[PDB]
Amino acid sequence: RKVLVLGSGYISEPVLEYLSRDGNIEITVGSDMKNQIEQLGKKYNINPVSMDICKQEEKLGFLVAKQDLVISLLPYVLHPLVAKACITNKVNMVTASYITPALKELEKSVEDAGITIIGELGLDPGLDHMLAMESIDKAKEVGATIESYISYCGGLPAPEHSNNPLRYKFSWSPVGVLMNVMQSATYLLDGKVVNVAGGISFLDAVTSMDFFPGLNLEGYPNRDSTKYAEIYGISSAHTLLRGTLRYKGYMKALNGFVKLGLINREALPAANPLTWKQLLCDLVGISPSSEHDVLKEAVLKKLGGDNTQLEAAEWLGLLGDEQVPQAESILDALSKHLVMKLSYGPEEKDMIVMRDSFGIRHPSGHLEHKTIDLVAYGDINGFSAMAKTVGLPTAMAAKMLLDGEIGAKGLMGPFSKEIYGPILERIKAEGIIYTTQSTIKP
Amino acid sequence: RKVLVLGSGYISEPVLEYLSRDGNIEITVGSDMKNQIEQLGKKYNINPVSMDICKQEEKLGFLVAKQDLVISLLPYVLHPLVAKACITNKVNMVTASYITPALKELEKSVEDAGITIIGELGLDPGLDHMLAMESIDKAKEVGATIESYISYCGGLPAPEHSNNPLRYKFSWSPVGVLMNVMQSATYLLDGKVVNVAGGISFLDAVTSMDFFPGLNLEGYPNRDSTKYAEIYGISSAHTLLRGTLRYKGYMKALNGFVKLGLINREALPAANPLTWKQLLCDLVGISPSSEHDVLKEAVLKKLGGDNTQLEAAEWLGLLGDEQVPQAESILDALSKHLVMKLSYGPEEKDMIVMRDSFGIRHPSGHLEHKTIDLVAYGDINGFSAMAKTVGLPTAMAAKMLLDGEIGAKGLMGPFSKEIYGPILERIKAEGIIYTTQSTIKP
């Protein structure tokens, strides 16, 4: 009846809410942010502690030893430090993020210590693993094999808040999503490995997504889908694809930012402070002059007469006299500015959409086409759909370890029926429902 | 502390829920349906009564006299019978429907009796009156006049349940909505009166609605918009238009039903019972024969090679061996069949969308363009968005009469600030929020 929550950020609130329901558990919180933990301590009954992880490893060892379990909501680079302290004191751990190559090396030490460390919980990774292995295990129960697996996913505003140039509102820092456009995408399709080129030409891979006629969606592939054959155990499959969902026009607007030279890690140009109008003059080539002058230069740079991309920049105030926020690069300067202009208000709803699609070959010979829809909306006077889908799987898994339901030991994901079965059933009560459909056509 | 709710239908549940919160009020229910009032009596504490209105007018007079207020949730043709009983016994009334020409004749008798009768509450009519007069009164507070008023509105499935040929699910009987396609539409636009022809050519008036880029909507005008100049007191306006919202493809599918000859009140054709395949053979002209034969005849009748309309009929089972439900006409037979195929399940969400747009001329000379968005989703384990928007205004208005907030007397709508102000503020807490925006551009 004692837990440590390392991290006082976005995901912490729904985790603290779920754990402090019965009343028996005693929650401790450790963080860098002094302002966050005070505001967080007002809402929920917790023991506040202030500490850095990589500098104050001495007190972490003593603090972890007092607890029954340790929940890590920190950046994924810092998990080996938290994992090392857990194996020494013989305490269980749960994580809401990737099991990195660095964390994988400890697996021998974690098994010898005789403790449980559950990684890759949340939305992605997390629910995508659980929904996949539910259907795959159901197929293997009747001797069937997987031929295809297509999975698109996506967090975005509720339709009523989609009227802006990007059709988007940022939950956290845009640096991650903006840099994904420059990266490559790899997947398997009808036997052949397909490579997609990132950067300026990545817009060519964007396709229309019409499974909901009322919802105007687009889609494109993720970083890597070929690694999931080994993870789920479906190397017999001829198709393996994972994608992302957005409203139509999103990627064309980001394509406009790539043309102008805003998506890079070069430093900002050096009496009077720098403005956005002045920054775009430097990028195009002209001197800091009139607003109508740089307008003619900007539209010339943005392909032909692409007024849509020009008006998108004009709307955000990129051809304007506002001050550029201080940052270590041009990309970071844009990211801070987008958080200012396109963030969620107090009463505005977010939304999660997910679409799985399986091609199952039964031993009879026929082909089953199975599809799963998961949809969830944010609450007005409550938690967001993104906060719930990332927070609740990690929180539910922690309660299962304390109550003693998960018997397995070592380092692992949520791939076993012991883990995913109980979690998928409990998220229905929290307002995360998923429907299933199935048809046959050899 | 005593109320009679005449009607045990769709709207009754949220009305009974709202009124029985404090506990002081005693609710009585009168209805034709014996099964409904038993099931309704299980959930909420009520006094059940069974009676017909036009046959048992004797007991209605005695029953109404016992109460402080009478809520009528019956068909609008029966309001003069309920109104006549109210004026005799000197009791207040509220209605969730139109104030008809028949009910308007009693206005002299209602004023002499010295009681309040509030009509035209709900969604439409109801909230449309309240949202209109809120903005119009705010304009007249600063000496401004109304030049334009455009109002589109619409109840429909949540985007995730829009994957069917009509992109729709019916809350009640389709007879009303199907017959609106055959009727005309009239409105004012830039000084000139516009008439729109109903029936086969009504599809030409359908336009794209792009105020939410994420939501794929279409729109078309309502029956009559010219009567609203006198109601709101905006005869100076050069534009008056009210429309309906649907997902794209809805009206093209209904256009297909008009071509085949399904939208009419002719009787059904007369050992073996009638099937849908046999009915479409009679309508096209051929004899009851093979399925592929009538398929070639049906596509020939549906304009050129319109496979979309053909597949829509095939999906619903109109070229199939299912039995036709018993009804007094072909339109009624279709309506019953659509309720069977396209109704809401237990866990499926509905949705309400509304969009007002004002052109306000200030005495300075400038033009203010004001817009109001109202959006609401149905609850999973609760009431639908349609049930809430129709039920709660009538229920809230009833509580204001009992508590003694509405001082005005006679027959009236919800046009006064005394009525609409308190209701618009209280619906926010129930999950019906509306945002406002305003810009200037002479």
State the smallest CA–CA distance between residue B171 and chain A in angstroms.
18
Contacts of A415 (CB under 8 A, 6+ apart): A129, A133, A231, A232
Q: Contacts from B46-51 at CB under 8 Å and sequence distance 24+?
A: B46/B5, B46/B16
Burial class of B440 by CB neighbour count within 10 A (0 to 12, 13 to 18, 19+): exposed
Q: Three-state SS for B319?
A: coil
* Nearest CB to B347; choose among A213, A373, A433: A433
DSSP codes, B261-312 = T-SS-PPPP--PPPBHHHHHHHHHS--S--HHHHHHHHHHHSTTT-HHHHHH
d(CA A67, CA A91): 7
The reply, when asked if residue B72 is annotated as ligand binding, is no
Subunit contact A214:B380, Cβ cutoff 8 A: no
A214–B contact, CB cutoff 8 A: yes
SS (H, E, C) chain A: CCEEEECCCCCHHHHHHHHCCCCCCCEEEEECCHHHHHHHHHHCCCEEEECCCCCCHHHHHHHHHCCCEEEECCCHHHHHHHHHHHHHHCCEEEECCCCCHHHHCCHHHHHHHCCEEECCCCECCEHHHHHHHHHHHHHHCCCCEEEEEEEEEEEEECHHHCCCCCCCCECCCCHHHHHHCCCCEEEEECCEEEEECCHHHHHHHCEEECCCCCECEEEEECCECCCHHHHHCCCCCCEEEEEEEEECCHHHHHHHHHHHCCCCCCCCCCCCCCEHHHHHHHHHCCCCCCHHHHHHHHHHHCCCCCHHHHHHHHHHCCCCCCECCCCCCHHHHHHHHHHHHCECCCCCCEEEEEEEEEEEECCCCCEEEEEEEEEEECCCCCCCHHHHHHHHHHHHHHHHHHHCCCCCCEEECCCCHHHHHHHHHHCCCCCCEEEEEEEECC
Q: Are B214 and A216 contacting, i.e. CB atoms less than 8 angstroms apart?
A: yes
| B1-123+383-432 is classed CATH 3.40.50.150 | no
Q: Could you tell me the sign of the dihedral formed by the alpha carbons of B133, B136, B142, B145, in that order?
A: negative
Experiment type:
X-ray
Task: Compare all CA atoms of chain A with the CA of B210 and give the residue at the minimum distance.
Answer: A163
Single-letter amino acid code for the residue at A156: L
Q: Are B377 and B351 in contact (CB under 8 A)?
A: yes
- Which DSSP symbol is given to B87? H
Residues 172-211 of A with CB under 8 A from B: 211
CB-count exposure of residue B177 (10 Å: 0-12, 13-18, 19+): middle
Query: Would you give the end-to-end CA distance of chain A in angstroms?
Result: 54
**Residue B252 DSSP SS3:** helix
β-pairing, B239-247 vs B217-221, is: antiparallel
Torsion of CA B295, B299, B300, B304, to 10 degrees: -160
Going from the C-alpha of B304 to that of each of B261, B276, B286, B307, B314, the distances in angstroms are 16, 23, 19, 9, 17
Local structure of B260: helix, strand or coil? helix
Q: How far apart are CA B417 and CA B403, in angstroms?
A: 17
A436 Cβ partners below 8 Å, 6+ apart?
A370, A371, A372
Q: At B433, which helix (H) or strand (E)?
A: strand B433-440
DSSP-assigned beta bridge partners for residue B128: none
d(CA B200, CA B198): 7
**Cα–Cα distance, A178 to A258 (Å, whole number):** 10
Instruction: Compute the distance between CA of residue A95 and CA of residue A179 in angstroms, rounded to an integer.
Output: 25
Alpha-carbon gap, residue A118 to A98, rounded angstroms: 10
Beta strands at B239-247 and B145-157: parallel, antiparallel or unpaired:
parallel
Partners of A158 on chain B (C-beta within 8 Å) are 375
Peptide bond into B48 cis (omega under 30): no
Residue B81, helix vs strand vs coil: helix
Q: How far is CA A183 from the centre of its chain?
A: 16
- Calculate how close chain A gets to B181, using CA atoms only, in Å: 21
> Is residue B270 less than 8 Å (CB to CB) from chain A?
no
Say how far apart CA B233 and CA B243 lie, in whole Å: 20
Q: Is A274 annotated for ligand binding?
A: no
Task: Report whether B221 contacts B187 (CB < 8 A).
Answer: yes
- Given the residues A22, A52, A124, A293, the one annotated as active site: A124
Between chain A and chain B, the number of residue pairs with CB atoms below 8 A apart is 66
CB contact under 8 A, A213 and B160: no
ω into residue A125 within 30 of 0, thus cis?
A: yes
Selected residue of B152, B212, B355 to mutate for chain A interface (largest A Cβ count, 10 A): B212
Q: Which two tokens stand for residue A307?
A: 């007024």
Are residues A159 and B347, on separate chains, in Cβ contact within 8 Å?
no
A344 CB within 8 Å of a chain B CB: no
- Cα angle: B212, vertex A152, A263; to 5 degrees: 70
Contact B347/A380, CB-based, under 8 Å?
Answer: no
Chain B: residue whose CA lies nearest to A161 = B212
| A51–B contact, CB cutoff 8 A | no
Q: Which residue has the tokens 């204001």?
A: B400
**Cβ–Cβ < 8 Å for A388, A382:** no
Q: Are B143 and B415 in contact (CB under 8 A)?
A: no
Tell me if residue B238 falls in helix, strand or coil: coil
Smallest CA-to-CA distance from B438 within B355, B360, B353 is with B360
Pair A431, B380: CB distance under 8 Å: yes
Interhelix angle for B250-260 vs B276-284, to 10°? 70
Quickly name the fold that domain B124-248+344-382+433-442 has: Dihydrodipicolinate Reductase; domain 2 (3.30.360)
Cβ B82 vs Cβ B70: under 8 Å? yes
Q: Which residues contact B83 (CB under 8 A, 6 or more apart)?
A: B93, B103, B106, B110, B117
> Looking at beta carbons, which residues of chain B come within 8 Å of A345?
none
Which residues in chain B touch residue A312, judged by CB atoms under 8 angstroms apart?
none
**Six-digit token pair at A420?**
């995913």
> Mutual orientation of helices B307-316 and B291-301 as an angle, nearest 10°?
130
Q: Answer whether B345 touches A (CB < 8 Å).
A: no
Dihedral (CA of B380, B382, B384, B385) sign? negative
Nearest CA in chain A to B353: A160
- From residue B140, give the alpha-carbon distance in Å to each of B126, B171, B363: 21, 38, 10
Backbone angles phi, psi at B165, to 5 degrees: -50, -40
> Among residues 282-321 of chain B, which lie with CB inside 8 Å of chain A?
none
Rounded CA separation A93/B64 (Å): 67
Task: Judge: B380–A157 Cβ closer than 8 Å, yes or no.
Answer: no
- Spatial CA neighbour of B335 closest among B349, B348, B324: B324
The sign of the dihedral angle between the CA atoms of B376, B380, B381, B384 is positive
CA A338 to chain centre: 18
Question: Which one-letter amino acid corresponds to residue B58?
Answer: E
| A212, A352, A430, A437: best to mutate for the B interface, most B CBs within 10 A | A212
A252 neighbourhood in chain B, CB within 8 Å: none
Which one of A159, A377, A431 has the shortest CB-CB distance to B214?
Answer: A159
B380 vs A167: CB contact, 8 Å cut-off?
A: no
CA distance linking residue B360 with residue B371, whole number of Å: 11
What is the Cα–Cα distance from B346 to A290, expressed in whole angstroms?
61
- B124-248+344-382+433-442: same fold as B1-123+383-432? no
Tell me: is residue B240 an annotated ligand-binding position. Answer: no
Can you tell me the distance from the alpha carbon of B420 to that of B410, in angstroms, rounded to the nearest whole number? 17
**A388 neighbourhood in chain B, CB within 8 Å:** none
Structure tokens, A353? 């959409």
Reported as half-sphere exposure (CB side, CA atoms, 13 A), residue A49 has a value of: 19
Question: Does the CB of A212 have a partner CB in chain B at under 8 Å?
Answer: yes
Which of B 363-382 lie inside 8 A of A, CB atoms?
A: 373, 375, 377, 380
Query: Are A350 and A157 spatial neighbours (Cβ–Cβ below 8 Å)?
Result: yes
Largest interatomic CA distance in chain A: 78
DSSP state, residue B98? -
End-to-end distance of chain B based on CA atoms, in angstroms? 54
CB-nearest partner of B212 from A162, A249, A431: A162
| Residue B361 marked in a binding site | no
Cβ contact A159–B212 (<8 Å) = yes
Q: Helices marked H in B156-215 — which ranges?
A: 175-180
Closest by alpha carbon to A231, among A372, A374, A114, A104?
A104
Contacts of B212 in chain A (CB under 8 A): 159-160, 162-163
Active-site residue identified among B22, B52, B124, B137: B124
DSSP character for B348? Answer: -
- Residue found by looking up tokens 């698109």 in the block: A152
Instruction: Please list the residues that pair with B239 across neighbouring strands.
Output: B148
Instruction: Tokens 């039903």: give the residue.
Output: B257
Domain residue ranges in chain A: 1-123+383-432, 124-248+344-382+433-442, 249-343
Q: Among this protein's residues, is B124 annotated catalytic?
A: yes
- Do A159 and B163 lie within an 8 Å CB cutoff? no
B97 is an annotated ligand-binding site residue: yes
